[PDB]
Design a protein around this ligand. Structure first.
Ligand SMILES: *[C@@](O)(CO)[C@H](C[C@@H]1CCNC1=O)NC(=O)[C@H](CC(C)C)NC(=O)c1cc2c(OC)cccc2[nH]1
Ligand SMILES: *[C@@](O)(CO)[C@H](C[C@@H]1CCNC1=O)NC(=O)[C@H](CC(C)C)NC(=O)c1cc2c(OC)cccc2[nH]1
Lengths: 292, 289
C-alpha cells in the first residue's frame, strides 16, 4: 500500500498568500514565506517588472486567523521569498532537497492555506508527478520526513494538458523543462521506473506468485538494451546493489528477476495478474517493499 | 487517488505505553490514555489488571513521562488516568464506523507516528491495513471540519494478512477476541455502493468507455451482484448516489447496467481511473471531497 508520511510538521507551515484576487498556498518557515511567484500575475509575463511594481502591503498573507505582514520580498527562480514580521513558532527542523526521478515523497494538498489531504507520489523520469491537484493547489508541498527532520522537495505549480503535474524544488528551479506560464507544455515521453517494477516483482514473490519467474538468464547490458526498446529506464549497477536485500530474502538473483521482467516486456501477460493487476506497478520503491 | 486526512491533530495524541517488556501505542486525550488492554499481558484480563499497580505503567509522550493516577478497563481497552492533561487534544468524538465506510490510519510505532493512509471497513469487519510489529494502539479516524472522529484502534493481524481492531469504546469490529489465536473473518464481499461511486468518479474525470445504452432494475442487478460476490444494492444506496447521479447526468440504474457489463465481460485490459480492478474503498462522500 501507498503510505504517506505524517503531515503534522508540515501543516503548521501552510499559509495563504493573496495578491489582488489570485490566491495560492505558501510555506512559512521562520520569518520567510515561500510561494510560486505567479501569485503576482499571464502568457509570457516579465516577472521582474511585476515584482518591482509591487509593495509589501499588496501581499495578504494569512496563517489561520492571524494576518502576517510582508516586511520585504525577493525572488528566487520561480518562487518568492516574502519576509514576515513573525517567525513561525511551529517551524520544524527542515532542509530543502532536490528529489531525483524514481524517488517518492508525500504531498500535503492545500487549498486556501488549509491542508486538505495527504497522499504519497513519485517523481517520474520525465520530471512530472501523477498527482491529484485541483484549482487552488499551487504552493502545496511535497516532503519526506527522516527522524524529526523534514525534507521539503516539491512546490506545486502546474498541471500539464495530459493530466500530470509539474513543480519546483524549494529553490524555485522547476523539475523538468517546464515554465510558469499559461501555456500548454508537453512532458517528455514517460519511461517506466525499472528499479521500482523489480521491487514490485520481488514483493510479488514474497507474496507467493512466482508464475513469471524462469530459468533464462541475462546480462545487465542485454537487459538494458531490451528495456530501452520498451521505454523502461536502464538498470544501473547501483540499482542492482539496492535490490540486494530483496534478492537474498527471496533467493532469486537480480539478473534472474531481470530475465523474468524481460520476458514480461516481450510477451506481456496473457491476461494474467501480479498482486492483482495486469499492469506493472512502478511507484513502490525497494524501501517501501522492505518496510512492509 | 486515495487521500488521507492530515494527521496533525492525531499525531499530538500519540504516546507510548509499556508494561514490563511489552510496548504499544496509546491515545492521549485530555487526562486519559487509551490503549489496547493486552499491554499488561489466552489469559483473564480482570485477574491481570488487579495485580497491576499504577506505578507499573510506563507512559511516555515523546521525551516526557506521564504518571498514571488510576485506571479501569472497558472492553479490550485500558483507560489510564494521568496527572497531565494533553495540551494538544483536538475537538473529537468516538464513533463506531459501519462496514463500507472509510477512514485514515495513523500507523504508529513505539509512540512515534510513522505513516498515514486511507482504508475501508470491509463487510466482514476487517480492514486491509499495513501494520507491522509494534503497531497496536494505532488509530483510525476522519477529520471532517475541525472535529476528529476516532473510530479504530489496532489490535491484530489475521493469518490472511488483514487486520482487526476495536472502536475507542474497546468493542471489537467483528467476531475476534484479543488472544494470541489464529482467527478467521467471514468471507469478504465487494462494497457495491463504493464501486458505483468510483464509476461516477471516473465519468467526472472523463473515463466513459464502460458506459452503455442499457438500464437495469434493482432486482436484476442484484441477481448479477450476488453471483459475483458484491453486496446487494438497496434503495437507500440509490438515494445516497443521488447527488453524483445529478452531477454526471447518469441515472443510478444506468450506472448499474454499466457495472453488470464490467462484471460479466470484465475489462478488456482497459483501465478505469488508472486501475485494472473495480475499486471499492472510495465512498460517495469521498468522491464529493
Ligand atoms: C495553481 O493552483 C495555480 O496558482 C494551479 C494548479 C493547477 C490547476 C489545476 N490543477 C493544477 O495542478 N496552477 C495553474 O493554473 C498554472 C499557473 C501558471 C504556472 C501561471 N497553470 C497551469 O497549470 C496551466 C496552464 C495551462 C494552459 O494554458 C492556459 C493550457 C493547458 C494546460 C495548462 N495548465
Ligand atoms: C500489537 O502490536 C500487539 O502488541 C500486534 C500487532 C500485529 C503484529 C504484526 N502485525 C500486527 O498488526 N498484535 C498482536 O500481536 C496480537 C496480540 C493479541 C491481540 C493478544 N496478536 C495477533 O495479531 C496474532 C496472534 C496470532 C496467532 O496466534 C497463535 C496466530 C496467527 C496470527 C496471529 N495474529
Amino acid at each position: 500500500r501507498k503510505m504517506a508520511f505524517p503531515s503534522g510538521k508540515v501543516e503548521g507551515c501552510m499559509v495563504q498568500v493573496t495578491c489582488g484576487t489570485t490566491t495560492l498556498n505558501g510555506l512559512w518557515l521562520d520569518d520567510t514565506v515561500y510561494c510560486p511567484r505567479h501569485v503576482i500575475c499571464m502568457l509570457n509575463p516579465n516577472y521582474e517588472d511585476l515584482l518591482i511594481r509591487k509593495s509589501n502591503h499588496s501581499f495578504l498573507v494569512q496563517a489561520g486567523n492571524v494576518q502576517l505582514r510582508v516586511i520585504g520580498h525577493s525572488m528566487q527562480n520561480c518562487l518568492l521569498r516574502l519576509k514576515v514580521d513573525t517567525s513561525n513558532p511551529k517551524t520544524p527542523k527542515y532542509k530543502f532537497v532536490r528529489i531525483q526521478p524514481g524517488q517518492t515523497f508525500s504531498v500535503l494538498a492545500c487549498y486556501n492555506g488549509s491542508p486538505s489531504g495527504v497522499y504519497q507520489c513519485a517523481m517520474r523520469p520525465n520530471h512530472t508527478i501523477k498527482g491529484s491537484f485541483l484549482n487552488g493547489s499551487c504552493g502545496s508541498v511535497g516532503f519526506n520526513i527522516d527522524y524529526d527532520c523534514v525534507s521539503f522537495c516539491y512546490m506545486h505549480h502546474m498541471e500539464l494538458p495530459t493530466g500530470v503535474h509539474a513543480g519546483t524544488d524549494l529553490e524555485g528551479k522547476f523539475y523538468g523543462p517546464f515554465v510558469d506560464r499559461q501555456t500548454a507544455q508537453a512532458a517528455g515521453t514517460d519511461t517506466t521506473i525499472t528499479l521500482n517494477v523489480l521491487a514490485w516483482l520481488y514483493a510479488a514473490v514474497i507474496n507467493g506468485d512466482r508464475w513469471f519467474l524462469n530459468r533464462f538468464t541475462t546480462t545487465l547490458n542485454d537487459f538494458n538494451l531490451v528495456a530501452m526498446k520498451y521505454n523502461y529506464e536502464p538498470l544501473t549497477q547501483d540499482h542492482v546493489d539496492i535490490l540486494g536485500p530483496l534478492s537474498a530474502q527471496t533467493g532469486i538473483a537480480v539478473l534472474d528477476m531481470c530475465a523474468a521482467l524481460k520476458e514480461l516486456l516481450q510477451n506481456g501477460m496473457n491476461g494474467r495478474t501480479i498482486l492483482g493487476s495486469t499492469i506493472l506497478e512502478d511507484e513502490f520503491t525497494p524501501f517501501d517493499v522492505v518496510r512492509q
